[PDB]
Symmetry: C5
Subunit: 206 residues, 5 copies
């Protein structure tokens, strides 16, 4: 357990061996979830990068948040991809929240507290519980097989994960700075593991 | 009767068989009306879509609100079309109010509480009372014959219908969030019928 | 006498025979004046139109306010024209005030409470008193000879006329909505005459 | 002495013989000064014009503020010119303050209370005391030889001149409209002389 | 010791021999530092210029802050360069803070109180203590060998240097004018040496 309030992981330069591993107390498979986080990078105009890699032994992309240059945000659960197009890209810290529900397949994508339209993806699916969560790298296998061209170079922090779907009002308090209690991943109670060239410094965003 | 406050219909993906059917207790033909609603979609840059389809046995487009790509808003009553051009299109939730009067033919179109100029359309017409109201699809016949390329993909809600013309001051309270009583269709007392892949989730707009 | 507060004239569709005739209790010829009004139309990008036509038996353009497409506002007194160029045109309600002085020829043109530079026009002239004032059409003769391509299609209201020149401080209150006592044309005590396809509905602007 | 508060000089139309002559009680030559004023004109997109002409028997451009079309602001003291480039030109009232110091050659140029970078001009010079100050025309000789193509057409006022350099804090109060005491030219105690077609009317700016 | 509060150095015109030399009480080599300053110039659109030149006998570019036209900000420590690209350049006063850490190589770059992403540079380096600090010129040798095309023409002031890395909260107060205490270079206690055509005048920014 570590209180990571006001701190953030920083990946200074592109690398093949830098990443942090988040550990989750999972026991039941997920029928829905919600992931929120902050990050800041200039790469969005040069190439793409991995933002949040959640892998399983049977599926290297169990749930992945990815930025594809010139296209926008890429959101894939269970190997199937959906896109949230973004034309104008301005370099600044950004806050994303994204949720998925099995019973309906609806996926919500919030960017800086403002919601994007709702789309479908993997209706009826069930996400694996025994996962490997990695920041700063894209997983091709369980916790391994990283591509350096998918590295994240910059700051990442404030990651929080639930096992249900957050309502608009809850998403607002999360972005606005209100008190929320995650039940999967908690920034204020993080069990993590550092590997490679990564540092912990005060966060740049408010 | 269903109180749909803070809830909205969501059509996740393009489809040919998804729609909700609103039921109206009409007895006299309409000599004027006013229709208001919220909706949110990214389609406006890809194609056009149906926003509100009100059909009669003799006229498949008794009153229709439609978005034509690259042109703007399309408003047709009794088969006759009038346009409200829109050059710049920004993706976000939008609130539309539109009214029509027979004695004058004047049509008003409000977008996010700001009015567009007044135009003429079907002066002296009389709208049919035995209608079929459909959301998420365009009607070519009484409650049927849907085109998939006219589907609405996204959120729609807060639909309310009167049988007279609302004054500017009245429209304001509806947009600003005040307490009003619709007299044709009431979001707070909706008799509807769901069909296909459609869901009811908390609304995204305030 | 009619109190026209909060009401406005609407010319829904293009026509050749629609207009209202304002009646003025004039006795002395005008050595200066000031005219203010609201209007709202989309025509500004399609063609030109007449906003306020003040005609005399000897001069069909005794004082005329006109929008010439691609050029801007046209202001002519006694047959002589002056232009206030406008490059960017955005469709929305607009408030114009315009004054003329004989002793100096100075003309002011205020748009939405913001003034344009001062220009000269017909120094020493004297405007006729026995006039015909028409809204929605352009006069080629005393109260007649309308051209349909000069029609005004939209809303017009809040027209008020003085027989002297209004100061900046006064113009401000008129735009902001303060109490003024006109002595030629008074919206709150209007003697007018309707003709053709014209209607009276609540005003759209605040 | 005349208090010209809230009133302004207006040059309605282009002319060769319209101008006002400001009279200054000078006795010592100027080793530094500061000039502030308001003005409003549409010419900036058509041609250039003279804003403030201070001439001597030996030097027709002892200190001149000039707008050169497509280039920006032109500032010349003692016959030597320096430029403050301006790319985008928007038509509205503008407030300029400009100062010069001999010991350093530093010139400051403030536009609407915001400063431009500092530049050099005529270090060690000494400005003549027996000058002719003219508004609305450009001087080629002592109080004469006007070029009509250099006329200023519009409003000008609030001109005030010191014999020292105003600090940033002081410039702010001058722009905001606070109590300042000029010791060369004072709007509230102006000894001037009108000639030609020029008028005194209330100012358009606040 | 000199208190330079509210004052700033001015380099009026391009020159080869104008510069101020800041003197620092250094004894130990720097394992990290942070530099903050204000500056204002129009050159950014014409050519590049030196902002802050810190040279050693063995390295003419021990730490240099430089603006390269059409590219953005150039930041080099120990001869190795890293870039913070800037596409749009608007002329106005600007406040920059920049820090470097040896243990991590992380460099932060704050512009007008807003941070750019974190990058790596010269991890494990050690900056020399016996340095020559120059403003307004670029050093090719210890305190000499200036290129005129690298001159800074405009205002510079409020320069402050620490020997550690400032946190986001500290950078904020420094931008706003907080009670910060530098321990290398202090604007409120500057031991400097002036040379050439440079002047000390009140600062232009707030
Ligand atoms: C199987 C879906 C792959 C999603 N994909 C996004 C493509 C946008 C650039 C990331 C590639 C993951 P990978 O490196 O393991 O192959
Ligand atoms: C008869 C008027 C048709 C109006 N129309 C708008 C055209 C703008 C793209 C929608 C088409 C209705 P439809 O699918 O039944 O033919
Ligand atoms: C005699 C001056 C005419 C002014 N004119 C403005 C031209 C800009 C399009 C309106 C035409 C008046 P008209 O219809 O009676 O001839
Ligand atoms: C001798 C310097 C002349 C400065 N000059 C500015 C040129 C920018 C268009 C105004 C011309 C003064 P002039 O009319 O007496 O010749
Ligand atoms: C050795 C690195 C040089 C950095 N450089 C920035 C280049 C961007 C225009 C300034 C040149 C220093 P110099 O004048 O001594 O050669
Ligand atoms: Ca993968
Ligand atoms: Ca990979
Ligand atoms: Ca149809
Ligand atoms: Ca259809
Ligand atoms: Ca006509
Ligand atoms: Ca005429
Ligand atoms: Ca001259
Ligand atoms: Ca001349
Ligand atoms: Ca160098
Ligand atoms: Ca050099």
């Amino acid at each position: 357990q570590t209180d990571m309030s006001r701190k953030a992981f920083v990946f200074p330069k592109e690398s093949d061996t830098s990443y942090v591993s988040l550990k989750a107390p999972l026991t039941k498979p997920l029928k829905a979830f919600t992931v929120c986080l902050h990050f800041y990078t200039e790469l969005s105009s040069t190439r793409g990068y991995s933002i949040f890699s959640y892998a399983t032994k049977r599926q290297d992309n169990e749930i992945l948040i990815f930025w594809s240059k010139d296209i926008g945000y890429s959101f894939t659960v269970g190997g199937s991809e959906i896109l949230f197009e973004v034309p104008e890209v301005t370099v600044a810290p950004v806050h994303i929240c994204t949720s998925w529900e099995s019973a309906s397949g609806i996926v919500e994508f919030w960017v800086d507290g403002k919601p994007r339209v709702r789309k479908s993806l993997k209706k009826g699916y069930t996400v694996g519980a025994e996962a490997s969560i990695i920041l700063g790298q894209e997983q091709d296998s369980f916790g391994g097989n990283f591509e350096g061209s998918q590295s994240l170079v910059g700051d990442i922090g404030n990651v929080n994960m639930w096992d249900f779907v957050l309502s608009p009002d809850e998403i607002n308090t999360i972005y606005l700075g209100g008190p929320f209690s995650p039940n999967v991943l908690n920034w204020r109670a993080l069990k993590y593991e550092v590997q490679g060239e990564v540092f912990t410094k005060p966060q740049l965003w408010p």
